Write a protein that binds this ligand. Structure first.
Ligand SMILES: Cc1cc2nc3c(=O)[nH]c(=O)nc-3n(C[C@H](O)[C@H](O)[C@H](O)COP(=O)(O)O)c2cc1C
Ligand SMILES: Cc1cc2nc3c(=O)[nH]c(=O)nc-3n(C[C@H](O)[C@H](O)[C@H](O)COP(=O)(O)O)c2cc1C
Lengths: 183, 171
């Protein structure tokens, strides 16, 4: 795949199935995330790989978080079923530290950029994924499951796999006119 | 041209930048890359500002004003005013945020931040490069007013552009 083409046509996929990226292709995804821009080279990220019986453990963690948040039956059921929408999930935590010259939001932003880079690396190899978050990124139960300290943040659950639909190449490039001004 | 995977795995920024800046169709490609940022709710929560030629001088004056009104000393004021002349082109990205309970503010800021990275990568993909900068004056009231920021908006980066010269756990 061409680099400019990937960037111009970057699309996510929510319908995902086996096979998951694995072995060297998963390692390529992880290294792409570690190349996220990073003010001060703080490497403010932790990555959790969720696969196989990890998905069942993730289901139990999310259900407990949904119950603890007071969600209704439908929300608890959605949390229970969430991990089985893809064969692999990578949870990205912004691991933040007190650096007076590097604001917290910049460290979080670097972790978020890692998510996007990993989705792009998936796409570049014939896989795809979708960056998901929702209210349970803020659940104490869920954050404790991902070893969050008080200043850390879950910035995404990146669902990964083989997309059921090939990424469309039949769609026009975005229009810049409403978003761009000359300063 | 450039392999997509090699772009991602070897991605690097560049701070030493010179003319020529990307222009014409190559700049348009950079902007279109930013507009493909992941976007929860398709809120399109971004505004881009092209800073070049006389806009660099106007940007310089705005930063100088911000440093001056914050009481910085002469060195800080001069560093602020000189900053835009380190690259032939700068793109300012504003996270233009709206109240949607299903899409918290931080996610919209994230989308705008991802737009910066995508634009930097599009520069790199075309033989240019750049560096995402921010600094303390992104918060300056006069600087935010210069970029039309409402209280809920945020300057997430100044992307300088030109011609260049232990983490993983199994759950
Ligand atoms: C920080 C962040 C959080 C997101 N969270 C969700 C989410 O919880 N659920 C969802 O469907 N999309 C979410 N999205 C949007 C998707 O990742 C994706 O961009 C969306 O499906 C639009 O498709 P596209 O990327 O192909 O344009 C999020 C995006 C960002 C930047
Ligand atoms: C939100 C954000 C703001 C940043 N601001 C600056 C900055 O003001 N000055 C700077 O030298 N680097 C800044 N960086 C880091 C650079 O963009 C770049 O990542 C750094 O020079 C490391 O080079 P590399 O991207 O090639 O790894 C910032 C990064 C992020 C994510």
């Amino acid at each position: 795949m061409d680099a400019l083409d990937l960037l111009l046509n970057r699309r996510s996929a929510s319908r995902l199935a086996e096979p998951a990226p694995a072995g060297e292709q998963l390692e390529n995804i992880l290294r792409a995330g570690l190349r996220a821009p990073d003010h001060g080279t703080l490497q403010p990220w932790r990555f959790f790989i969720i696969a196989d019986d990890g998905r069942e453990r993730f289901s139990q963690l999310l259900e407990k978080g949904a119950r603890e948040a007071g969600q209704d039956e439908k929300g608890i059921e959605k949390a229970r079923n969430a991990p089985f929408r893809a064969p692999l999930i990578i949870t990205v935590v912004a691991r933040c530290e007190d650096h007076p010259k590097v604001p917290r939001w910049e460290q979080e932003m670097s972790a978020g950029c890692a998510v996007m880079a990993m989705q792009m690396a998936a796409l570049a190899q014939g896989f795809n994924g979708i960056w998901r978050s929702g209210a349970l990124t803020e659940s104490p139960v869920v954050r404790a499951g991902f070893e969050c300290r008080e200043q850390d943040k879950i910035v995404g659950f990146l669902y990964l796999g083989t997309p059921q639909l090939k990424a469309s190449t039949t769609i026009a490039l975005p229009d810049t006119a409403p978003f761009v001004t000359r300063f």
